[PDB]
Ligand binder design. Structure first.
Ligand SMILES: [Zn+2]
Ligand SMILES: [Zn+2]
Ligand SMILES: [Zn+2]
Lengths: 211, 278, 251
């Protein structure tokens, strides 16, 4: 096991969090996780991102209102320099995680150019960021944290129930052999104790679906 | 840590590739057997012992679990047997013997492309077993791929349909980079010629998103060459000139540390000039 | 008794009795699901009653603006897919038809705008398949031998049955309620008037208010201007009798 010789740590991947609803909270949590792991440069980078991702820095629709924080040197130039340094270090995890964190927040020709310049990530270099995210998801799948891989990949640019008789619109389990099914929680609760189909057709749905 | 796994083989080992999850280990030896151990939680449990080859098995390669836990093996008997799980036991699901000589290298295609097994045999031809479904494999053999015989085949990570490409290293003293044309046939795109002897292993570096495709190759003469593409232009950089023959080269998960194993019965890890870590 | 936090013009349970819809006097309807207000609507609401859950969590609101709004489940502030505003007069009440007869809503303004939705998934369209011109009561009968019936009260109860052959429907009363049958051969009618009246149809000392029937239609709750929610029930002689008195203030 030579994971200590690699720029990607399983502990960091397990400790990282992702919530697009609140970016500052997730950045602070990532900084705490990096401090727990012991990588000081990750701590500094995560604190810098925490500061630079606050909603008070939201880009304005009007180009003449103010200079967007992306055009600020502590914006894209900071992020571009960090990405170049981590590419030199080949740190896929940090690159993809930073790209996801910064992308979560994010006359006609002038308006289009302003929309291009207001993003802290390069609009013309989104393919590379998507590649980083996909590769980090691949590494997470390698580790086995499928939920973390799904969470990271969310930022890539590219019938009536037979138990409660309530219309099912969300998650649902349906048996292919008999055809009676309903809400996922209802089926979980019903099959945790019994083994016969709730509709009474006699189908042993556990022996018919599970595998 | 260290996991000393007793091979329990009847002859010398030739390959040892662990599974995708890093939980199961599969090894092959000259005893015409490929027994798959379970190395989870520091153990040595023989999940299944396989004996279906008429000769020594050279290389094995696990397939992506997204298409199921499948292992392929290339042996001296000029036949490639693809092993798959069936209710918790390993069985020979498909066998391919379309080559007139021993198949030396097998590597599964990237999961994005699909389930394609690229077999590189000593007859000079390369066959790609594309999985069409329903237990049916379509073989598009690339005859006369090498002047004498292909000894190594390495797929390239999905980079942008998909431009499927792989690196082939044979006894022709050169490396042939094959590209999948829009029609469907496979034709060589660029030829890389820097080794002075037979090429034994080629290993395309996994791409993390860097606009730089990296190729690592080793030859019989003992030289290991690192090829980079900053265009379809490759500039080799001699990593090292080893005293003895170099057998296998393998990249790290981030393609920063290269595992070089040669005939000197030693394993060296090189990280970027390239400096040895071992 | 337990005066949970909440002027509610009308408060009614859903089919499961786990969510409560209350129509405030400020022209607002809330789904008070420990009943804590889990929604806010501003309505457009004299009466707010749920629909059958298999048809969706639809709440029908009858307003004084000559409309009968129907707020459909879109998750919280539910979006009005449909708006039955074709009624010329103010909708006194909006009570959904029983689940067996389809998605029908009755707004006894006197025009009984029985709006039918052929598409259950797309209820945005309301079709006045029937129109017969104070209280609207639906017959819960689902029997093959019991034709669907619609009752209309006037501030005095007339039952219109959709006859199969013609394929067409054919003291002041404050509220009329039909007891759940549960296989009964007769229907029990409860009408809110100056005196509480119970009648059998076999094929407070003041102004009464919206009396309701329990899930089995045996115990009765009749409310009036007396301020006491008197609980009524049957007797050993199959006759209506008092079964208890409940205090509105909780005493
Ligand atoms: Zn069933
Ligand atoms: Zn259900
Ligand atoms: Zn079933």
């Amino acid at each position: 096991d030579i994971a200590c010789l690699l720029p990607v740590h399983k502990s960091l991947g397990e400790l990282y969090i992702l919530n697009v609803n609140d970016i500052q909270e997730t950045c602070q949590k990532n900084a705490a996780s990096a401090l727990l792991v012991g990588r000081k440069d990750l701590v500094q980078v995560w604190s810098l991102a925490t500061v630079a991702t606050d909603l008070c820095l939201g880009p304005k629709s009007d180009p003449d209102l103010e200079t967007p924080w992306a055009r600020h040197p502590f914006g894209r130039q900071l992020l571009e320099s960090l990405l170049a340094h981590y590419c030199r270090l080949r740190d896929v995890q940090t690159l993809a995680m930073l790209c996801s964190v910064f992308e979560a927040q994010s006359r006609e020709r002038e308006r289009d150019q302003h929309d291009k310049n207001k993003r802290l990530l390069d609009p013309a270099n989104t393919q590379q960021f998507d590649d980083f995210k996909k590769c980090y998801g691949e590494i997470l799948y390698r580790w086995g944290l499928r939920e973390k891989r799904a969470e990271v990949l969310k930022f890539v640019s590219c019938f009536q129930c037979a138990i409660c008789h309530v219309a099912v619109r969300g998650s649902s389990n349906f048996c292919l052999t008999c055809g009676h099914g309903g809400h996922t929680s209802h089926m979980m609760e019903w099959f945790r104790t019994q083994e016969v189909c709730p509709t009474g057709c006699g189908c042993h749905c556990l022996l018919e679906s599970t595998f | 840590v260290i996991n000393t796994v007793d091979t329990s083989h009847e002859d010398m080992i030739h390959d040892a590739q662990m599974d995708y999850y890093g939980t199961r280990l599969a090894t092959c030896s000259s005893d015409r057997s490929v027994k798959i151990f379970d190395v989870r939680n520091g153990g040595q449990i023989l999940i299944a012992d396989l004996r279906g080859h008429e000769g020594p098995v050279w290389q094995v390669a696990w397939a992506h679990p997204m298409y199921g836990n499948i292992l392929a093996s290339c042996s001296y008997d000029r036949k490639v047997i693809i092993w798959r799980e069936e209710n918790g036991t390993w069985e020979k699901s498909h066998e391919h013997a379309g080559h007139d000589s021993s198949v030396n290298s097998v590597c599964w295609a990237p999961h994005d492309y699909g389930l394609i097994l690229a077999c590189g045999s000593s007859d000079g031809a390369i066959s790609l077993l594309t999985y069409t479904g329903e237990g049916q494999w379509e073989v598009k053999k690339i005859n006369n791929a090498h002047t004498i015989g292909c000894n190594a085949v390495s797929w390239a990570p999905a980079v942008v349909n998909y431009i499927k490409r792989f690196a082939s290293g044979g006894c022709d003293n050169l490396i042939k980079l094959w590209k999948e044309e829009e029609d469907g046939q496979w034709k060589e795109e660029q030829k890389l010629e820097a080794h002075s002897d037979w090429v034994r292993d080629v290993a395309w570096a996994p791409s993390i998103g860097l606009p730089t495709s990296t190729i690592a190759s080793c030859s019989q003469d003992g030289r290991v060459f690192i090829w980079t593409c900053d265009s379809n232009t490759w500039s080799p950089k001699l990593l090292h000139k080893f005293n003895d023959v170099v057998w296998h080269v393998s990249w790290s998960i981030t393609a920063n540390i290269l595992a070089v194993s040669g005939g000197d019965n030693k394993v060296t890890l090189w990280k970027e000039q390239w400096v040895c870590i071992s | 008794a337990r005066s949970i936090a909440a002027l509610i013009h009308d408060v009614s349970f859903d089919f499961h009795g786990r969510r409560m819809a209350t129509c405030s006097s400020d022209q607002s309807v809330k789904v008070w699901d420990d009943w804590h207000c889990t929604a806010s609507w501003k309505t457009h609401v004299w009466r707010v009653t749920w629909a059958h859950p298999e048809f969706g969590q639809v709440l029908a609101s009858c307003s004084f603006d000559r409309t009968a709004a129907v707020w459909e489940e879109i998750v919280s502030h539910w979006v009005k897919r449909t708006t039955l505003v074709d009624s010329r007069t103010s909708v006194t009440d909006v009570k959904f038809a029983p689940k067996h007869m389809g998605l029908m809503l009755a707004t006894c303004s006197g025009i009984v705008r029985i709006y039918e939705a052929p598409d259950v998934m797309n209820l945005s369209q309301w079709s006045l398949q029937h129109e017969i011109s104070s209280c609207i009561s639906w017959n819960p009968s689902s029997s093959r031998a019991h034709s669907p019936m619609i009752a209309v009260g006037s501030d005095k109860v007339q039952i219109f049955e959709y006859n199969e052959n013609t394929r067409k429907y054919a003291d002041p009363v404050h509220d009329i309620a039909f007891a759940p049958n549960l296989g009964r051969s007769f229907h029990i009618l409860a009408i809110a008037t100056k005196d509480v009246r119970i009648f059998t149809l076999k094929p407070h000392n003041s102004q009464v208010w919206r009396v309701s029937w329990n899930i089995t239609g045996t115990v009765l709750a009749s409310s009036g201007d007396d301020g006491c929610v008197r609980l009524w029930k049957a007797n050993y002689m199959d006759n209506w009798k008092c079964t208890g008195i409940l205090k509105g203030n909780g005493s």
